[PDB]
């Protein structure tokens, strides 16, 4: 089964994401983006609705991590020691899992500056479901 989370931007910073969240101990990274990894590095360095990349300089490359508990199907986020921080419903979190539920807000970063690509990421947890 594909456990999906839908992230809708509340501050005009990204196209709505439809993310398949892997079961722990795997996870989906949130952050800023002639080779055997070319086809994988290409799509992985893009900002796509199906990946965790955002076009915001405020974000760390490895900023936060989403994972799914295969026992309950619950979705968790944790910070990856980002420079500018991960927030859930406004609360600054750390490196331990925090559960996400529909109606929650995830903010990535803070920003000194609200201009194009300098604005923090504000993501609303619009839906969580299987398949």
Swiss-Prot record:
Broad class of where this protein is predominantly found: endoplasmic reticulum
Keywords assigned: Cell cycle, Coiled coil, Endoplasmic reticulum, Membrane, Protein transport, Transmembrane, Transmembrane helix, Transport
A Gene Ontology BP annotation from the UniProt entry: cellular response to pheromone
Residues of the FHA domain: 28-93
Subcellular location: Endoplasmic reticulum membrane
GO CC terms, sorted: cytoplasm; endoplasmic reticulum; endoplasmic reticulum membrane; endoplasmic reticulum-Golgi intermediate compartment; FAR/SIN/STRIPAK complex
Additional remarks: Present with 377 molecules/cell in log phase SD medium.
Assembly description: Component of a complex at least composed of FAR3, FAR7, FAR8, FAR10, FAR11 and VPS64.
Chain's role: Participates in the control of the reentry into the cell cycle following pheromone treatment. Involved in vacuolar protein sorting.
Name this protein carries in UniProt: Vacuolar protein sorting-associated protein 64
Annotated organism of origin: Saccharomyces cerevisiae (strain ATCC 204508 / S288c)
Gene name in the database record: VPS64
């Amino acid at each position: 089964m594909a456990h999906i989370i839908i992230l809708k931007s509340m501050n005009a910073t990204f196209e709505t994401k439809f993310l398949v969240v892997p079961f722990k101990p795997d996870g989906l990274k949130l952050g800023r983006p002639n080779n055997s990894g070319s086809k994988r590095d290409l799509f992985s360095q893009q900002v796509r609705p199906d990946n965790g990349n955002f076009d915001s300089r405020v974000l760390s490359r490895n900023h936060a991590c989403l994972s799914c508990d295969p026992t309950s199907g619950k979705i968790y986020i944790r910070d990856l020691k980002s420079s500018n921080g991960t927030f859930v419903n406004g609360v600054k979190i750390r490196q331990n899992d925090v559960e996400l539920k529909v109606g929650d807000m995830v903010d990535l970063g803070t920003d000194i500056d609200s201009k194009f690509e300098h604005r923090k990421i504000s993501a609303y947890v619009e839906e969580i479901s299987v398949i």
